[PDB]
């Protein structure tokens, strides 16, 4: 029993409008450098589809995540320590630049410098950002399948269509599309960390953000295969890997991440979650993969339980963090309302970025239809997005928790309409799904009204604990190059001292 | 030493039974990302693009440069029961930062090399620049040498000194020798950047140049609105969607085109609201709804009619709804009496009965011919309050109080005459559901459906007699409702295939009849249960069809029948362009120099380009084929452009150029003729010694010569009939594929001169201001580097929310860029000196069409009279346009531009038919902007910076100054006789300042300029004031107009709505197969909904947007159509027709229904486009295949709600009816001499 | 000749060794961000699997051989592995490695110079270091036929005499080389040169061979620091 905290994220897919604003803001701030211009820490994919990189969900091809051996022990699908080491000269599974797309630019200056007397109007053609050579044609991009862009037989290769008879969905009337925005999961049992030979990847203790140390990374590029979500991108120029850093510079002072604060749809929720680090392996090694979801929920702790509060304190959790945890929207959607589900729990990484499945128009029927248990509003059975599809995505193929979330969402709707249109109290739908009036009203507060202060409840990472904030306040930022940053030993070959430190020791004790 | 650090100690406790290890090692490296996030400061700014977004952003400056942006989240929060707006934003918005130092930034003023060479050589022989310009423009080979260089490279770096002089010189020459109205400017949607638009508009107004329109030109103007409410466009705010319990997104892709507001839609669902999407394809909007209906594109009006049918049947006839009944009784023209005309064996609906028609004139001395009549429940006839006749000439009766216009007593209008008729008459109704192309299903009945209407005979004041009936009765018949008279053309069941039944529409639309019935029922039931909280969000999906009015009136009737308009949570939510510049009357005087001279030269752009880019010379549509079957065909002969010319001379629509003679010389000639200028012009117009320029657009003096383009990409976006603009306006190579009227030997117009070889290259000088080298720039003569939205001050408002916020300079404009405001200020300055000796204190004769909201709107009450045809005298301001006298002080242009004129104090300020005193505001402005020390404008407030201008707008507008807001409501109270000041009394002290909005966006003040309220308990909902304050809709009847009784409306078969199939542009059958490349060609409907990776063409060159999209111009096709054509996903394809051709790559998809193709709006002509195999030129753009085709009903003027107004009414640029030929390309030649060409096999 | 002899085998070896060590230390302390393997695999997977494995498996074979061959003293099992036995091994075991190595390296160089994406993103040092290694490998294999003329391990004894004198800092190391075949001199010079260029090339990845990983706990967590 060792309690740790992390700011989790829940995305309400039902509200996602597939706008990509989240992707653009992340790109502008973090990955506009040459080397990672093709990398999209945050990317949005339209489903059905194979995504970015192409078919990242196919673990038989890419070898991401873990596997539970027959002896019950966990091993990365990539192979054990030696197997992995024996693949280091050339990672046999490494996705190629082409699996993403070849980053391109256009020759705009040709519109400006086109010489006088040109036979045809000048134009700007594409050029490779990798070779600088002229590109005959752009044949791929990071969001190439946006809004069902491509033949159905192509998009349906989607790994999430397994065990589903998909023929019916190629018919115009049964068409359906949804959006899947994604970033790094910042897992409790990250495969990347387990697959990095040099140990450059780590999970921060105070907030669970997983980073790739840019000093220590050696560019062994195995972590990339290791991540089953393929959210680690190789910086082809620096030779090191980079990934979503959960905007730690902001989180550290209590701010939302950029993709969270900039989400036009107001679908992202940030809240603390307390977990028992000592239960991680036990939970991720459970025999049946349809249990990882529930096993993870069991790894999460109740913030209002004095037993947990006292243990958190004893274990070093700041008081403000415990408080933030007690009013965490992420906990309300994952633990109480059971609306949020993990992304591909079967990878056994214990993902910390969850999703609320989306609703969708009713399916095509013989006639205008009839009033179901929810009147004019939809019943869960009438939704056109095949629930089995959603289950392959969020619950390892188990449709029970998906239906439960969808049903409850519709229940809330049914109750609110009774209240606002009929001006009556009708809890028929709520009781059917096991929700109380109070729970429904609260669900409505967070999901519908979604005040800024309710979507983001981020505590400080308290950069002052166990460190020396005073000399840091006074000297950080003066980057003259003192050469003493990054090590604990004071001795340095250039005979220098830290600019943001006190080297004249007090002699008064 | 990191090396020494490698030397057990850093190992803490393990966890999870040895599965994990806690390390106590250095983390200093984390500073690496921290220092990237850190910045110098954040500045508040927004985007000056036409998106209706109006989102406030945080501009981050780091290392003294703009590096990125994130949304501001500090908007004043909405009520506790409503979700807030933060963070708003969209993808394009998030990528603007890219422009600032991108490879496509315009840094210096540029000039076509060929033009510069002749300029510098001409200046060496002519010390005076005006005469230097003359030496080049009056030479045929010189003029031609640079006009044919347009779009063909050769831009060289110039300087502000050089271009400012050439521009000024050219303007002077053009004004002096041809007329001020031969100089024009095009800039759209001022709400997105009020002062930036004002810059050019102000300079142009002062010098008399024409200011072209945009709302109608872009087809955002829904003519149906002016028709029904007498309002350009007023809609509820997005927040109000959250007060609705039933919403239908009809032809509106909310999540993609209203991104920053979508959440109100996804969230209101959790409140119990049901949502329904109506789109032919599986659009993004569908993903968010509970039901998806997919009618065949263009057939939507059919569905609406059917739904209206069910509603009337079920909630008006069978089980009448109290709420709906009272609602249509008091707020529509339904109880209004219509006179019946005698046909052959049957009657036809004529104009509406007027007080004047009755003997004692119902006691109406004032404007009796402009007041509608109805029957009260006691059988008595009466002229009810609110008719447009009570608006002018009298006071206190222009309201919706159900009272008798004579006695002033409380009456009750009766709806149907059924039950008190003197006999049953048979009235014929036009039916077009049987016509149409092969691409849309049709249903045969009769061109004229006869219905049995209950009537009453009246004894008219002129002795004769006539039959009458109510709009109501007429409406139920048009809808096919059986009322007991046993009408063979009325429905017997919803399955009966008759005039607008669910079964009928099922055939036209393809939407299951039961679906139509179910949703019609739910919608109406909801509206009944909530008192109008049903709403329809509609957009370009319907409004860009030639028959947009029918599509719209269909939706409008549904809402009116269910009493949804004017109620929070209900109504007509039209969202297209960002046309709601809230501080209207504070901005108008600034943008059109109305503080100095009145009036300015406004022009409706569709007619302007139709005429000058000569798109009429290729017209395939005839007015005759749009005529009602019950109209006298011989009374409407002529080319569609002939109706425009007549409309102009009758004072209905504006003109540009106005006259065939320099309007600055007319005064000197009246002086010699011994008569004043006005009278002398009317005498010449009657004599024909002076003619309207429209009559001879190619004689060499009636075509614009100088054009300014800014905040617009006219020649790569909005420009319908692109190839025609390149040929007739620019004089460069073009890709037009068809022959003109002359070549086909068709009938020439009867109002416009004809000449086989059309005049080309009419534009002498095209000047474009922009921050990126757009398609328009590429085809200009002079490019002026302007400041990005992150480098200047300005303001922005939108229809979506009530906040007014600013654009601010994060840093000074980079390189040699300047804000639009400073560019025009400098030009006006050089103009003021260059003009000395050529222009002084001139006298200008300006024509001004009859204005809506002015007393003159009451022009021709009963019919149409063409003075040129001798049907009446030429009376300016009534049967022709006003002929105004305007004095211009050309040398003082700059001083006037940089100061607020004396007219605000002398005459006052106002708008929308009301005026108030604005002296106190001017005194405040003298203290805030300081005053001119000397010169012509001595003592007047200053306008040096964009900020002074912004402050001018804020201080003068009632929306941003409570003081003015009260004087404004006071003014309107004189008309209605009801107090409206209470709407703003509790905010009278309120005064919005520019610097305050930089600190935090501010909510505006309820103003008479609009019909919604800015309140803390009720959201902003259009028409709320009419319904709750009893203020009339500026329509003939004062109520919402279901019946249009204008001669033209009646004869073009649109007195009542009716189904109209998409028109045939006949642009395919003449070129299909004429240039085979070996691949199969097929005809498909060409739709251009607005894109996801940009806003129009802006952002289309933005690498971020291009990388998230498909890397350049693309076109969507159904899988079936692509497979038939042998087209694979991403193959190079060519789309073309009579108007031109374009090249692009295909996106094959299942969500695209067979029969249609979509090239998401504006991807323009500068990125990734190969040569055409059809024109042998650079591939064209989406508007290379479209062509303007005006509609007569949109030219109607001098008739109450149907009277002109800048962006209020006028012809529109529809384009969804268009068809194209599609095919896989073969040879992919880039025409760049790179030798990097390809060939697509099979 | 005698001058160039003492320089290259008495002096130079110590210059290259000082630059190798202090250069590695200095670049480790002040160039952590530059301390990477610089993989280019993603940009062009074609042929990398075969070529890289061929090169690395071979080059490592040689290294084990060179290491134990010249740095292991004689009195250490001189009865069970006398000088000529070591030579037999180095010629067949090492020669086979060297063949695998040369093929891999040649394929890698062909790719680095002619694969558009790799060539466009390469640095000069990457071409220079890889070219010198291919050459050093060919040279190495070319010494096989020369060592075959002295199957008694007389040649190998001289080279091992030199190497061992150099690393124990015993002056006169070049004497041990008296009369050895020229091809061996070139191999030694170009080889030590690789050590000199080591700290300023991608070779620094060698220092980071991840042995620790074999015994490391899977999950890592860093405390507040
Ligand atoms: N991202 C982005 N946002 C913008 C703009 C932009 O360029 N980009 N521009 C502004 C401006 S200026 C306008 S005029 C509007 O956005 C137009 O959007 P709207 O959704 O009304 O039109 P659109 O023409 O796209 O049509 C919407 C959808 O309706 C479907 N549709 C098309 N034709 C029909 C039809 O005949 N009937 C029906 N029922 N539906 C039809 C279609 O799915 C389309 O996407 C607005 N904001
Ligand atoms: S910003 Fe929000 S709504 Fe838009 S795509 Fe990203 S997650 Fe979805
Ligand atoms: S472009 Fe318009 S909608 Fe997009 S962020 Fe800017 S203002 Fe908002
Ligand atoms: S495997 Fe480790 S060495 Fe770097 S490239 Fe991945 S974090
Ligand atoms: Mo528009």
Curated annotation (Swiss-Prot), chain A:
Q: How does it sit in the membrane?
A: Peripheral membrane protein
Query: Could you list the residue ranges that cross the membrane?
Result: none
Record localization: Cell membrane
GO terms under biological process: anaerobic electron transport chain; anaerobic respiration; nitrate assimilation; nitrate metabolic process
Domain of life assignment: Bacteria
Q: What is its main location?
A: membrane
Q: Which Gene3D superfamilies match?
A: 3.30.70.20, nitrate reductase domain like
Q: What induces it?
A: By nitrate.
* Residues at which [4Fe-4S] cluster 1 binds: 16, 19, 22, 263
The record describes its quaternary structure and partners as: Dimer of heterotrimers each composed of an alpha, a beta and a gamma chain. Alpha and beta are catalytic chains; gamma chains are involved in binding the enzyme complex to the cytoplasmic membrane.
NCBIfam families registered for this protein in UniProt: narH (TIGR01660)
| Name of this protein | Respiratory nitrate reductase 1 beta chain
Look up and give the organism this protein is from.
Escherichia coli (strain K12)
Gene name, please?
narH
Curated annotation (Swiss-Prot), chain B:
Task: Describe the reaction catalysed, as an equation.
Answer: nitrate + a quinol = a quinone + nitrite + H2O
Q: What Gene3D superfamilies does UniProt report for this protein, alphabetically?
A: 3.40.50.12440, nitrate reductase tail
**Which parts of the sequence belong to the 4Fe-4S Mo/W bis-MGD-type domain?**
40-104
* Enzyme Commission number(s) from the entry: 1.7.5.1
Q: Which GO terms describe its biological process?
A: anaerobic electron transport chain; anaerobic respiration; nitrate assimilation; nitrate metabolic process
Show the Pfam families listed in the entry.
Answer: Molybdopterin, Molydop_binding, Nitr_red_alph_N
For membrane topology, the record states:
Peripheral membrane protein
Q: Which family does the similarity line name?
A: Belongs to the prokaryotic molybdopterin-containing oxidoreductase family.
The protein in question is named: Respiratory nitrate reductase 1 alpha chain
In its UniProt entry, the species of origin is given as Escherichia coli (strain K12)
Q: What would be the name of the gene that encodes this protein?
A: narG
Swiss-Prot record, chain C:
Modification N-formylmethionine occurs at: 1
- Which parts of the sequence lie on the Cytoplasmic side of the lipid bilayer? 30-47, 113-124, 199-225
Q: What class of enzyme is it?
A: oxidoreductase
Annotated compartments? Cell inner membrane
> What triggers production of this protein?
By nitrate.
How does this protein lie in the membrane? Answer: Multi-pass membrane protein
What are the names of the required cofactors? heme
TM segments? Answer: 4-29, 48-70, 83-112, 125-148, 183-198
Designated name of the protein: Respiratory nitrate reductase 1 gamma chain
Species of the source: Escherichia coli (strain K12)
Q: Which gene encodes it?
A: narI
């Amino acid at each position: 029993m060792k309690i740790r905290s992390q700011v989790g994220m829940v995305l309400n897919l039902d509200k996602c409008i597939g706008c990509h604003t989240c992707s653009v803001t992340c790109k502008n701030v973090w990955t506009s450098r040459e080397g990672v211009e093709y990398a999209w820490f945050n990317n949005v994919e339209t489903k059905p589809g194979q995504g970015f990189p192409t078919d990242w969900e196919n673990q038989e091809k890419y070898k991401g995540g873990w596997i539970r051996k027959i002896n019950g022990k966990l091993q990365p699908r990539m192979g054990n320590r030696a197997m992995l080491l024996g693949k280091i000269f050339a990672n046999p599974h490494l996705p190629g630049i082409d699996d993403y797309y070849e980053p391109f630019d256009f020759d705009y200056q040709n519109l400006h410098t086109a010489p006088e007397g040109s036979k045809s109007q000048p134009i700007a053609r594409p050029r490779s950002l990798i070779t600088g050579e002229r590109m005959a044609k752009i044949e791929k991009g990071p969001n190439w399948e946006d809004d069902l862009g491509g033949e159905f037989d192509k998009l349906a290769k989607d790994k999430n269509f397994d065990n589903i008879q998909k023929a019916m969905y190629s018919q115009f009337e049964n068409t359906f599309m949804m959006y899947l925005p994604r970033l790094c999961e910042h897992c409790l049992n990250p495969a990347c960390v387990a697959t990095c030979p040099s140990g450059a990847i780590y999970k921060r203790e105070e907030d669970g953000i997983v980073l790739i140390d840019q000093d220590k990374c050696r560019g062994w590029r195995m972590c990339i295969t290791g991540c089953p979500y393929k959210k680690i991108y190789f910086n082809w120029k620096s030779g090191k890997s980079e990934k979503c850093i959960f905007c730690y510079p902001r989180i550290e002072a209590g701010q939302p991440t950029v993709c969270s604060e900039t989400c036009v749809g107001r679908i992202r929720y940030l809240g603390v979650l307390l977990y028992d680090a000592d239960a991680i392996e036990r939970a991720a090694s459970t025999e049946n993969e349809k249990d990882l979801y529930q096993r993870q929920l069991d790894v999460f702790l109740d913030p209002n339980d004095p037993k947990v509060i006292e243990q958190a304190i004893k274990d070093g959790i700041p008081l403000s963090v415990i408080e933030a945890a007690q009013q965490s929207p992420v906990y309300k959607m994952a633990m109480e309302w059971k609306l949020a589900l993990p992304l591909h729990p079967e990878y056994r990484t214990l993902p910390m970025v969850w999703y609320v499945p989306p609703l969708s128009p009713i399916q095509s029927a013989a006639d205008a239809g009839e009033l179901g248990s929810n009147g004019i509003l939809p019943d869960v059975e009438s939704l056109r997005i095949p629930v089995q599809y959603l289950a392959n995505l969020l619950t390892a193929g188990d449709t029970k928790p998906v239906l439960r979330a969808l049903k409850r969402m519709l229940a809330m709707r049914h109750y609110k309409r009774a209240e606002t249109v009929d001006g009556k109290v009708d809890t028929r739908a709520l009781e059917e799904v096991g929700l109380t009036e109070a729970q429904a009203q609260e669900m409505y507060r967070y999901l519908a009204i979604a005040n800024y202060e309710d979507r983001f409840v981020v505590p400080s990472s308290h950069r002052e604990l166990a460190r020396e904030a005073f000399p840091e306040k006074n000297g950080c930022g003066f980057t003259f190059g003192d050469g003493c940053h990054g090590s604990d030993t004071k001795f340095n070959l250039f005979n220098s001292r830290r600019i943001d430190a006190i080297d004249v020791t007090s002699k008064t004790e | 030493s990191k090396f020494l650090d490698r030397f057990f100690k850093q190992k803490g406790e393990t966890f999870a039974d040895g599965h994990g290890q806690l390390l106590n090692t250095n983390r200093d490296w984390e500073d690496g990302y921290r220092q990237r996030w850190q910045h110098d400061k954040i500045v508040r700014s927004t985007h000056g693009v036409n998106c209706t977004g109006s989102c406030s952003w945080k501009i981050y400056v780091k290392n003294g440069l703009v590096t990125w942006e994130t949304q501001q989240t500090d908007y004043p929060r909405t009520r506790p029961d409503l979700p807030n707006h933060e963070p708003r934003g969209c993808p394009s918005g998030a990528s603007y930062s890219w422009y600032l130092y991108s490879a496509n930034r315009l840094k210096y003023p540029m000039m076509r090399k060929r033009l510069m060479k002749m300029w510098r050589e001409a200046k060496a022989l002519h010390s005076d620049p005006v005469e230097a310009w003359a030496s080049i423009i009056e030479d045929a080979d010189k003029a031609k040498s640079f006009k044919q260089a347009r779009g063909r490279g050769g831009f060289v770096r110039s300087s502000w000194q050089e271009v400012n002089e050439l521009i000024a010189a050219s303007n002077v020459y053009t004004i002096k020798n041809y007329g001020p109205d031969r100089v024009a400017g095009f800039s759209p949607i001022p709400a997105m950047s009020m002062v930036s638009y004002a810059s050019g508009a102000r300079y142009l107004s002062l010098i008399g140049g024409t200011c072209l329109s945009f709302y109608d030109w872009y087809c955002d103007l829904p003519p149906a609105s002016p028709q029904t409410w007498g309002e350009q466009t007023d809609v509820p705010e997005s927040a109000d969607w959250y007060n609705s319990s039933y919403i239908i997104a009809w032809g509106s892709n909310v999540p993609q085109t209203r991104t920053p507001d979508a959440h109100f839609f996804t969230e209101v669902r959790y409140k119990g609201t049901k949502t329904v999407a109506v789109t032919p394809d599986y659009a993004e909007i569908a993903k968010l709804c509970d039901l998806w209906l997919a009618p065949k594109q263009g057939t939507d009006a059919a569905m609406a009619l059917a739904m209206g049918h069910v509603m009337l049947r079920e909630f008006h006839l069978d089980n009448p709804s109290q709420y709906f009944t009272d609602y249509v009784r008091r707020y529509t023209d339904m109880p209004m009496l219509v006179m019946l005309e005698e046909r052959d064996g049957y009657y036809a609906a004529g104009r509406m009965l007027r007080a004047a028609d009755l003997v004692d004139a119902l006691g109406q001395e004032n404007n009796p011919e402009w007041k509608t009549v109805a029957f009260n429940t006691n059988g008595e006839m009466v002229a009810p309050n609110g008719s447009i006749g009570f608006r002018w000439g009298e006071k206190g009766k222009w309201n919706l109080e159900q009272r008798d216009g004579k006695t002033g007593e409380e009456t009750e209008l009766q709806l149907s005459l059924l039950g008190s008729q003197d006999e049953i008459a048979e009235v014929g109704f036009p039916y077009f559901g049987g016509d149409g192309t092969e691409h849309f299903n049709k249903v045969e009945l009769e061109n004229v459906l006869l219905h049995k209407l209950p009537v009453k005979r009246l004894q008219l004041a002129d002795g004769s007699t006539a039959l009458v009936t109510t709009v109501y009765d007429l409406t139920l018949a048009n809808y096919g409702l059986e009322r007991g008279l046993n009408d063979v053309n009325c429905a017997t069941s919803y399955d009966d295939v008759k005039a607008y039944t669910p079964a009928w529409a099922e055939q036209i639309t393809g939407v299951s009849r039961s679906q139509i019935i179910r949703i019609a029922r739910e919608f109406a039931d909801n509206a009944d249960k909530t008192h109008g909280r049903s709403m329809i969000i509609v957009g370009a999906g319907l409004n860009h069809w030639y028959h947009l009015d029918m599509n719209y009136r269909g939706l409008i009737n549904m809402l009116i029948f269910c009493g949804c308009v004017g109620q929070s949570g209900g109504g007509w939510a039209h969202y297209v362009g960002q046309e709601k510049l809230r501080p209207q009357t504070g901005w108008q005087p600034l943008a059109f120099a109305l503080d100095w001279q009145r009036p300015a030269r406004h022009m409706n752009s569709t007619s302007y380009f139709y005429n000058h880019s000569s798109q009429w010379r290729y017209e395939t549509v005839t007015a005759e084929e749009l005529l009602s079957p019950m109209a006298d065909k011989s009374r409407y002969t002529g080319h569609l452009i002939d109706f425009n010319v007549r409309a102009e001379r009758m004072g209905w629509l504006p003109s540009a150029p106005q006259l065939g003679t320099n309007p600055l010389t007319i005064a000197g000639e009246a002086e010699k003729a011994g008569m004043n200028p006005v009278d002398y012009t009317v005498k010449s117009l009657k004599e024909g010694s002076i003619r309207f320029a429209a009559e001879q657009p190619e004689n060499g003096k009636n075509h614009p010569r100088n054009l300014f383009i800014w905040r617009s990409n006219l020649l790569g976006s909005s420009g319908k009939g692109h190839e025609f603009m390149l040929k007739y306006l620019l004089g460069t190579e073009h890709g037009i594929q068809g022959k003109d009227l002359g070549q086909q030997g068709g009938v020439k117009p009867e109002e416009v001169d004809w000449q086989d070889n059309g005049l080309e290259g009419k534009l002498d000088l095209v000047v474009t201001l922009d921050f990126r080298l757009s398609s328009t720039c590429l085809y200009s003569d002079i490019i002026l580097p302007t400041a990005t939205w992150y480098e200047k001050d300005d303001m922005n408002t939108s229809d979506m929310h009530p906040f007014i916020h600013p654009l601010s300079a994060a840093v000074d404009p980079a390189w040699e860029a300047k804000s639009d405001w400073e560019i025009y200020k400098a030009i006006a300055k050089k103009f003021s000196e260059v003009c000395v000796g050529h222009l002084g204190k001139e006298t200008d004769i300006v024509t001004l069409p009859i204005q809506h909201d002015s007393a003159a709107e009451l022009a021709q009450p009963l019919d149409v009279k063409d003075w040129k045809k001798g049907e009446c005298d030429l009376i300016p301001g009534k049967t022709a346009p006003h002929i105004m006298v305007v004095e211009r002080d050309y040398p003082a242009t700059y001083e006037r531009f940089t100061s607020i004129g004396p007219l605000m104090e002398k005459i006052g300020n106002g708008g929308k038919g009301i005026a108030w005193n604005t002296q106190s505001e001017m005194d405040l402005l003298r203290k805030l902007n300081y005053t001119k020390a000397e010169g012509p404008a001595k003592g007047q407030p200053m306008l040096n910076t964009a900020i002074d201008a912004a402050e001018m707008i804020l201080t003068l507008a009632p929306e941003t100054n409570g003081q003015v807001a009260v004087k404004a409501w006071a003014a309107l109270s004189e008309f209605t006789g009801r107090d409206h000041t209470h709407l703003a009394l509790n905010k009278e002290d309120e005064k919005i300042r520019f610097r305050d909005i930089q600190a935090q966006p501010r909510k505006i003040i309820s103003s008479p300029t609009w019909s919604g309220l800015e309140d803390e308990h009720v959201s902003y909902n259009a028409g709320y004031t009419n319904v709750h304050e009893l203020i009339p809709w500026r329509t003939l009847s004062g109520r919402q107009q279901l019946y249009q009784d204008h001669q033209w409306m009646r004869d073009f078969g649109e007195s009542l709505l009716v189904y109209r199939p998409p028109i045939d542009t006949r642009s395919v059958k003449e070129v299909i197969g004429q240039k085979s490349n070996g691949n199969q060609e097929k005809a498909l409907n060409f739709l251009t909904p607005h894109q996801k990776w940009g806003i129009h063409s802006t952002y289309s060159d933005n690498l971020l947007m291009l990388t998230l999209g498909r890397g350049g111009p693309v076109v969507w096709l159904s899988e079936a159509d692509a497979k038939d054509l042998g087209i694979a996903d991403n193959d190079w394809i060519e789309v073309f027709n009579s108007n031109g051709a374009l090249t692009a790559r295909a996106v094959v998809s299942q969500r695209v229904p067979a029969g249609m193709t979509m090239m998401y709006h504006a991807q323009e002509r500068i990125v990734n486009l190969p040569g055409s195999e059809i024109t042998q030129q650079r591939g064209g753009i989406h508007n290379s295949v479209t062509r303007i085709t005006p509609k007569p009903t949109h030219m109607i003027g001098g008739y109450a709600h149907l009277a002109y107004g800048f962006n209020y009414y006028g012809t529109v640029g529809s384009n969804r009816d268009e068809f194209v030929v599609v095919r896989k390309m073969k040879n992919i030649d880039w025409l760049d001499g790179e030798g990097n060409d390809q060939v697509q096999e099979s | 000749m005698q001058f160039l002899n003492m320089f290259f085998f008495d002096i130079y070896p110590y210059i290259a060794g000082a630059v190798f060590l202090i250069g590695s230390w200095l670049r480790y302390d002040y160039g952590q961000y530059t301390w990477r393997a610089a993989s280019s695999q993603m940009l062009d997977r074609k042929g990398m699997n075969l070529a890289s494995n061929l090169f690395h498996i071979g080059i490592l074979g040689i290294f084990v051989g060179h290491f134990f061959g010249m740095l292991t003293p004689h009195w250490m099992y001189e009865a069970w592995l006398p000088i000529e036995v070591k030579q037999k091994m180095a010629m067949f075991a090492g020669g086979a490695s060297g063949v695998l190595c040369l093929i891999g390296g040649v394929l890698l160089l062909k790719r680095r110079l002619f694969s558009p994406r790799v060539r466009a993103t390469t640095t000069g040092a990457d071409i220079l270091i890889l070219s010198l290694l291919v050459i050093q490998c060919a040279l190495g294999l070319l010494t096989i036929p020369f060592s075959a003329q002295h199957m008694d391990g007389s040649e190998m004894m001289k080279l091992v005499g030199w190497a061992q004198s150099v690393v124990t800092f015993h002056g006169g190391a070049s004497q041990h080389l008296d009369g050895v075949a020229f091809i061996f001199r070139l191999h030694l010079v170009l080889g030590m040169t690789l050590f000199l260029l080591f700290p300023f090339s991608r070779l620094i990845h060698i220092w980071s061979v991840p042995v620790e990983y074999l015994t490391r706990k899977y999950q890592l967590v860093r405390a507040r620091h």
